[PDB]
Every structure is written in structure tokens, then in C-alpha cells.
Amino acid sequence: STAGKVIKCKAAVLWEVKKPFSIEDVEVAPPKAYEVRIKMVAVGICRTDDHVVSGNLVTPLPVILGHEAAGIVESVGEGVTTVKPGDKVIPLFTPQCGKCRVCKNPESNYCLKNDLGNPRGTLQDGTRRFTCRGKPIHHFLGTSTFSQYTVVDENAVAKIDAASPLEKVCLIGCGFSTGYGSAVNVAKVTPGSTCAVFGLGGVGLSAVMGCKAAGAARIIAVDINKDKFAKAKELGATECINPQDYKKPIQEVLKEMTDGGVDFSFEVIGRLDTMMASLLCCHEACGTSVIVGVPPASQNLSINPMLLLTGRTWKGAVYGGFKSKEGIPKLVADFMAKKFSLDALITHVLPFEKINEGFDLLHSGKSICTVLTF
Amino acid sequence: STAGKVIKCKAAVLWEVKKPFSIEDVEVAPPKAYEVRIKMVAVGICRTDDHVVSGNLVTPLPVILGHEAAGIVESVGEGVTTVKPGDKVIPLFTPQCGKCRVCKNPESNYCLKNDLGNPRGTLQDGTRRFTCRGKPIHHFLGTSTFSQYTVVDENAVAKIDAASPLEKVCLIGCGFSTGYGSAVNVAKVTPGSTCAVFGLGGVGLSAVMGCKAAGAARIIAVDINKDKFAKAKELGATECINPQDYKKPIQEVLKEMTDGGVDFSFEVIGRLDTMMASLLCCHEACGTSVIVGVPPASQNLSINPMLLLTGRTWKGAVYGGFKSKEGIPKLVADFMAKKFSLDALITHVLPFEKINEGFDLLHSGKSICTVLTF
Ligand SMILES: [N]C(=O)C1=[C][N+]([C]2O[C]([C]OP(=O)([O-])OP([O])(=O)O[C][C]3O[C](N4[C]=NC5=C4N=[C]N=C5[N])[C]([O])[C]3[O])[C]([O])[C]2[O])=[C][C]=C1N1=[C]C(I)=[C][N]1
Ligand SMILES: NC(=O)c1ccc[n+]([C@@H]2O[C@H](COP(=O)([O-])OP(=O)(O)OC[C@H]3O[C@@H](n4cnc5c(N)ncnc54)[C@H](O)[C@@H]3O)[C@@H](O)[C@H]2O)c1
Ligand SMILES: [Cl-]
Ligand SMILES: [Zn+2]
Ligand SMILES: [Zn+2]
Ligand SMILES: [Zn+2]
Ligand SMILES: [Zn+2]
């Protein structure tokens, strides 16, 4: 079959920034001890993959991007015990090693084995498993899912329900868990509260769902693209506003609309201005502002400390606060039990080969979550 | 009786910024409905009072400062149901109107009837009560305690135990509650956690106490004034560090000795550089940084939101997060229950008239909490 042997498959390689994805033939090496080789079934296009392409997120190039996915274990390396071939799995962009200070803390999830802080672009052992034209290709967030087959560390993969529809549940790999957890875990939206969500893509809309689920009484959705309004309202938004319709700065508008400011603001775009407006629109005395969007590299915000002194809370989080390996499978169970649906988010489905077309949809703002099938 | 009549007394008025306080004769008009005229018995010198003197905190001048205090109800206005003459009381720089959005929210205390956000220098009805040489003198934070008599709104005054040593219990009026509550109420320091406290003035030392009461395992006290360490140690600090002894940045020094960073850091000074170090020294994935120090006017920080995205929580609070009308007396009760001691804080006791000498000791750093008696 393929276990123990090198696999030669297709992968979308980014050789340089601001350049189209090149579909190459790569050699995927067999998994070492404590690694799992996965056969991809469905991958979602997260903006963070785009952040690398536009040059806003730095990470070693050439590289195989992708981190929102679902697939089947092709083989496991010696030592692997949490999963076996044929198992349906979801690769996790933030591992859960279970040994570190962070992992052993019940309230934090940014595991110390991540590759976000200082991007080595390798697996946890400091080595790569891809080769294209003889040249070694870097991994992204230790998942590199834009490939027919990838190898990830064991603590970076979760075994999910065998009955899970992979083309739906892959969104739980990032988009959904990130947005839903931001509301539910990170901010911890109280019942009867008012929330404002800035940005309405797959992640932001999921944040709307999580606010709805938290029992928020009012959910104001903000986006400059009005086409997103139908979905937003459908998912729980009590009202949607377009900053371009006003002469006043977005935060004053919200302050006036909510008797002084929302209780929870969510920045789910990744811009300095929306991050500021987001902190500004929540009530000075009892507002919590949560940053979900990923900021452009080495950009700084100028903030007057007095904004926080009155009683505001500013915080950010990766993966919606979910301890990865432990939390994702549970969200899949919730999906199976029909606790929430992912159908409104998936607007486009294309074959992996059309990956570039997928990104064009994101750029045009015509798509929410686009899924690539292998 | 003096009730109904205008009281003529001595008060430390400030006419110009950065000039000595003038002990003059002012006229304290009688309390209007819902107001209380209090006879000051002991006022403490809080660093914020100094901020107005130095120009760091802007407020209308002329003004009678002072807010950390205790006294006896001289007389009450019409409709006053919470206090009666003779009742030992404590004025609150932040009131608890009890009927506003912030007051109805259990997790917040910045009552909308405060005079910090936008200083008017008046009592809640928009008018002044003091006069000096034919001119009206402004109030400060609605309290104005550097006067033998003062008039405060009912919701900005709390009655305490009719046996409380007002010469000590006055620290609960600001300094102690602010620091203590910041650890207990705002950070919500967890048992076995590791904390860092930048600034060992009366408020920092109080935070140390609160960090120990919460059951922190390590309390690293940071200060350039070496003479504070003995007190810090005495109050619970596991170790004291002086930034000047190092050739390396204090934040780095602190991360290196706490395996990545502390769990809860507190900035209890009011400088931007210290507020930055304080944010930087708490673990990037599970650290909560709390701002206690009132920063200088108009100055603001430059931060990379990536500092928050990984898991950090940044918040600030006034009055240690305590809802003034309810928390202050409760605190006194605990003091009355001998649960804590303010003796280690009060380092100098001066007669009201020696007020300028008080601020001199504060500027020299050879004092923690100086009390002025009447
Ligand atoms: N934290 C975490 O974890 C995360 C994050 N993230 C981020 O977030 C963001 C967003 O996402 P998305 O959803 O995917 O995207 P999109 O689709 O693109 O959306 C966007 C939106 O928004 C809007 N806008 C823009 N601009 C504007 C707006 N609104 C308003 N205003 C303005 N100006 C548009 O229209 C649309 O709708 C980003 O940043 C991302 O990145 C994600 C995820 C998660 N992670 C982490 C990771 I290292 C990976 N991932
Ligand atoms: N948030 C509030 O409710 C609230 C309440 C009371 C006071 N405050 C503010 O908290 C701050 C301090 O209060 P305080 O009464 O304890 O003041 P304080 O001046 O007596 O204490 C300042 C301490 O900081 C130390 N310090 C100064 N620069 C330092 C540095 N660069 N590095 C390390 N240590 C340094 C000084 O040696 C001193 O020990 C002030 O801004 C005060 O206005 C805020
Ligand atoms: Cl007047
Ligand atoms: Zn993502
Ligand atoms: Zn870990
Ligand atoms: Zn109020
Ligand atoms: Zn004070």
C-alpha cells in the first residue's frame, strides 16, 4: 500500500509572496515517531492562509499552506496511540502537547509547541517532510493541509466521529471553533448582553452564532460589504450596519445605539482601525473587547491607558480559547447532535485543483467559507 | 448647632498648578437635599491628589483636593436615608448612584455620576458648596476632603463601624481598597499563582497584601526605592527586585525567572514604560496584566496587538473594582475583624496645616501613607 513508503502527490506550493499557488508534485515522507500521515478529504480557505500570500504574516517560504481541514489517517508512526489508520481526523493548527505550562493551565490554549510565535516552518522535531523538485518545502502551522497528503504531530491532530461529514466538519478545524469560542470561551458573553461583531466572514459569522448561543439580547453586525447582511441576520444578528453609510466614526454610532457602548465587541477582520474602533465602541466601564483578527506584521496601535483604567477589558485568543485536541472532537459531537449547522457558511465548493479560484472568491468578497475537495 | 448655617473653616486650597497649597478660610454651605456635610477627622495623601498639583491630572482650578478620608456626619440634607449625624463615615471618590447602567451591572463600579471622566468640579447637581474670598472653589472627585468640612452627595458616602479608628480606617477610603481590590476583584488572582507588582507605594503594598490573601505562591515586588523592600517582604512579597541592578530589561528579567512570565502583573505607579513592562512580563498565553496607576494626561502607549492575540488579558480598574457604597464598609468590617493591618502603611502623621510637608515626603520617597489629622 503506502505505509512506510514515500508518497508522491499533488500539493499547492507557494514559492513567493503575492504569487499564485502552484500545483506541484511533491514527495511526502513517511511519518516518524509520534506523527500521523493524513489523507486529505476537505480543506477550507481561512484568511490566515491569505495573510501569508499577501505578505502580512511572515513564515518560511517555499511553503505548503492550509490548516482548516479534515481527512483520514493513512498511517501512523511508532508511538502514536491516540489514532490509527482509517480514523477520521481534524488537523489542529495549535497543538495540545499536554505537558507544558500552558497545556496544564485549564484556561489557556496557546501551547508552547506552536509555530506561530517564531515560525520554524517544520514539524515539532525541527525537520520537514515535503520535497518538491528535490528542494525541501516548509510546513505551515505544522499542518500544511493544502496537499493531498500531509504529516502532522500527534498532539496536533484530533480523532473525530467516524460518521462525521468531512466536507462540513472541516470548518471546525479553524473558522467555526475560532469564532464560536471567541464568544463562548474567550469573552464569555453573558445572557441579555449586547454585542458588536466587526467583520462577517466565516469566523465573524461564527462569532455571531456564539453570541446568539450565549443568549445575547442584541447582536450588531458590522461589515462594509452589505451582501453579508442576509446571512448575519439569518445566523442571529439583531441588526447589521455599514460604516460607509455614516458621516460619524463607527464607534460613536455604536455608542449612541447602545446607551454608551456594547458589552462585548469582537474584531474579526485584522486591521488596526477596526481593532481600535472595536475597543472604543464597548462600554468604558463594563465592556470587553476581543481581538480575533490577525494583525499585519510589526504594526502598532497607539492607545491611551485611560481607556482601560475606567474598567475595560482587552484580550485576544487563538482558536477561540479551545484546547485543541481535547475540544475539537466535542464540537464535532455537538455538530452531529444538530446543536448548530455549518451549511449557511459554506457558500462554495471547488476541487483542490481550483484553489487559486477559491482565493479569488475570498478577495472578491463573494464567498464566506469555500471548501476544496480532493 | 451649625446645621443650616454656612460653616467657615480652614481648607487647603490650590489656586494655581504647581504651587504650594494655601491654608485659607473657606465657607462651606449647608447640604442640599440628598447631601451630607461631614466633619473631617483624618485625610490621607493619595498620589492622584499630587497628579493634579503636578498637572498630570487636569481638573478645574481653584480646587480643594483630597478624597482619601474619614469623618463624622455633621449634618444631612432632606431626603437622606442612609446616614444620620454622628455616624462615622468614609467619602467615596467614585459614587454608587445605584440606579445607572454601570451600578446595575454587578461586575462594574465606575458609576456614571463620577467626576473623573469629564471633571466639572461640582457636586452631582452641577453646583459648588465652597467659597473663598468671594470666589467659588471647585470640588474634586465630588469629595474634596482637604478641608475641615465638606459636602458630598449621599451616594458618594458610606457609613462605617461606630468604633473604627478613623486615623487608620481612612486608608480604606482609597489607597488600600484600590490596591487590595485590584488583586482580589480585578485580577482575581488564583491560588498558587505568580504575581509581580511594579510600585511599592501605599497602593502597590496593598496589592501585595491582596495577592497574598488570594493565595499567590510568588509575589515579586518591583521598585527602584530599595527602602520599600522590607515593608513588601513584611507584607507578603516573596522577593524584591530593583530594575537598576540589572543590565537587562526588567520584563526580560522577570520572564526568565518565572518560566515565561508571571500570571498576574500589576502596574501601581503611573508611567507608560512601567505599564509596558508590566504587560510584557506576564505570560503571553495566560497572563492578566492590570493597570492601577493613573497615567499622565494625553500620553499613550504603542502596542502590537499580537501581544494580546496569544492569550493575554489587559484590563484596568478604579477603586479596586469595589462598588463603593457596599464594599468600603464591608472592608472596614474585615479590618474591624482584625483580618488585616494598616499599621505597616502609615509612616507619617502630620497636622492638617502641615499639608505641604506631607507632599514633600511623598516626593522624597521617604514615606508610604502620610495621614493628616484635624
Ligand atoms: N484568532 C484566530 O485564531 C484566528 C483568527 N483569524 C483571523 O480572523 C480574521 C477574519 O477571518 P475570515 O473570517 O476568514 O476572513 P474574511 O472572509 O476575509 O472576512 C473579512 C470580513 O471583514 C469585512 N471587512 C473588511 N474590512 C472591513 C470589513 N468590515 C468592516 N470594516 C472594514 N474595514 C469584509 O467585508 C469581510 O466580510 C482574519 O484576520 C483571520 O486571519 C482566523 C482564524 C483564526 N486563526 C489563527 C490562525 I495563526 C489561523 N487562523
Ligand atoms: N486606580 C485607582 O483607583 C487608583 C487609586 C489610587 C491611586 N492610584 C494611582 O496609583 C499610582 C500610585 O499610587 P501610590 O499612592 O501608591 O503612589 P506612590 O508614589 O507613593 O508610589 C509610587 C512607587 O513607585 C515607585 N516607582 C516610581 N518609578 C518607578 C519605576 N520607574 N520603577 C519601579 N518603581 C518605581 C516609587 O519608588 C514608589 O515606591 C498613582 O498613579 C496613583 O494616582 C490609582
Ligand atoms: Cl456655584
Ligand atoms: Zn484559520
Ligand atoms: Zn502544550
Ligand atoms: Zn451609578
Ligand atoms: Zn486615591
Curated annotation (Swiss-Prot), chains A, B:
Transmembrane segments: none annotated. GO terms for molecular function: alcohol dehydrogenase (NAD+) activity; all-trans-retinol dehydrogenase (NAD+) activity; zinc ion binding. One of its GO terms (cellular component) is plasma membrane. SMART domains: PKS_ER (SM00829). Gene3D superfamilies: Medium-chain alcohol dehydrogenases, catalytic domain, NAD(P)-binding Rossmann-like Domain. Pfam families: ADH_N, ADH_zinc_N. Binds 2 Zn(2+) ions per subunit. It is found in: Cytoplasm. There are 7 different ADH's isozymes in human: three belongs to class-I: alpha, beta, and gamma, one to class-II: pi, one to class-III: chi, one to class-IV: ADH7 and one to class-V: ADH6. This is All-trans-retinol dehydrogenase [NAD(+)] ADH1B. The gene is ADH1B.
